Design a protein around this ligand. Structure first.
Ligand code: NI
Length: 341
């Protein structure tokens, strides 16, 4: 059974609600992004209308085989009428194709569903500038002040400088980057660009990346592993055993691995600055954990909410424990008393 924070009142609509069977009263199922916790339940046998971005709809068709007649792609930043209700899709600054959804209800209520997002001051100059929001369905993944991390631009600067230095010292070093979902593509693209290489990967990953509308992608990626000195591997393989095994397969082309694991936040962020980050090393293999987040930090979330001034907030993450719920409600009241809404 579908929980309340996935239903949009006054509509036939649900958001990210595919694992509950047929939802009573639902005439259109919105999907904010192609991450498995959110699409859980969709397959080629799905027969109700799905509304999404173009990039999400390419993934639904090619990766999950949803039939085309049920995929309804909408352009971003454009007022659209769906089943008699005005909606807009906005870029969420999450993974490729990820959207927030603005719903203009028939009674005059305006609702923003953020999906998963990384709040940014640029969102203060989107179509949100123009009008009031009564209800905010908020991605609260890192809603506590202990959650700090650097900008994506600082993290990429660290990765590129670390990879360029290592491979210039040792031309026979291979770089490996872990992945397990879409998102975070700038990590491996930025490293391969500084090295003058294509990125090498499995056929399954190449297929996924070909659905993402990245400009000049054919110039950046390949399935010919022998031609490339930046390889992608599943995230589960980014450990000393899996990397040793990979280096064997490379026919004596390389004598060292430098590997990256993009994570979200980890507790070493409470102590260590990005510039001071060091790897774990075993012989000729080194592994860097880098805190590349596609969700809001606490401070980014607080800024966005204090700017938007919603009348009511419904969290969509960390909703399963009383302690998490109580914590989040305390911070929403702090924010509201501090800003005066
Ligand atoms: Ni996500």
């Amino acid at each position: 059974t579908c929980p309340f924070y996935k239903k949009i009142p006054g509509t036939g609509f649900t958001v990210d609600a595919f694992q509950y069977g047929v939802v009573e009263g639902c005439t259109a199922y919105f999907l904010t992004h192609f991450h498995s916790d959110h699409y859980a339940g969709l397959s080629k046998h799905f027969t109700f209308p799905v509304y999404c971005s173009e990039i999400t709809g390419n993934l639904l068709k090619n990766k999950l085989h949803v039939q085309e007649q049920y995929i309804h792609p909408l352009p971003l930043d454009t007022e659209c009428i769906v089943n008699g209700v005005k909606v807009v899709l906005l870029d969420a600054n999450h993974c490729p194709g990820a959207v927030m959804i603005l719903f203009y209800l028939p009674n005059g209520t305006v609702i923003l569903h953020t999906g998963d997002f990384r709040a940014d001051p640029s969102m203060e100059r989107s179509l949100l500038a123009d009008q009031k929001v009564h209800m905010l369905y908020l991605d609260t993944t890192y809603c506590s002040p202990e959650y700090t991390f650097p900008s994506q631009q600082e993290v990429i600067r660290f990765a590129i400088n670390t990879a360029f230095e290592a491979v210039t010292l040792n031309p026979h070093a291979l770089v490996v980057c872990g992945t397990y979902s879409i998102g975070k593509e700038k990590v491996f693209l930025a490293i391969a660009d500084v090295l003058g290489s294509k990125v090498g990967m499995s056929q399954e990953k190449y297929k996924t990346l070909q659905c993402l509308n990245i400009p000049e992608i054919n110039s950046l990626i390949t399935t010919d592993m022998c031609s490339s000195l930046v390889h992608l591997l599943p995230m589960m393989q980014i450990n000393f055993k899996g990397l040793q095994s990979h280096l064997k397969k490379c026919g004596g082309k390389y004598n060292q691995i430098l590997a990256f694991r993009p994570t979200g936040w980890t507790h070493s962020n409470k102590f260590t600055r990005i510039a001071d980050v060091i790897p774990q090393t075993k012989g000729n293999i080194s592994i860097y954990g880098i805190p590349y987040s596609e969700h809001s930090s606490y401070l980014e979330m607080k800024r966005f909410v204090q700017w938007l001034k919603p009348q009511k907030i419904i969290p969509t993450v960390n909703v399963g424990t009383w302690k998490s719920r109580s914590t989040m409600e305390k911070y929403f009241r702090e924010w509201k008393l501090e800003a005066g809404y």
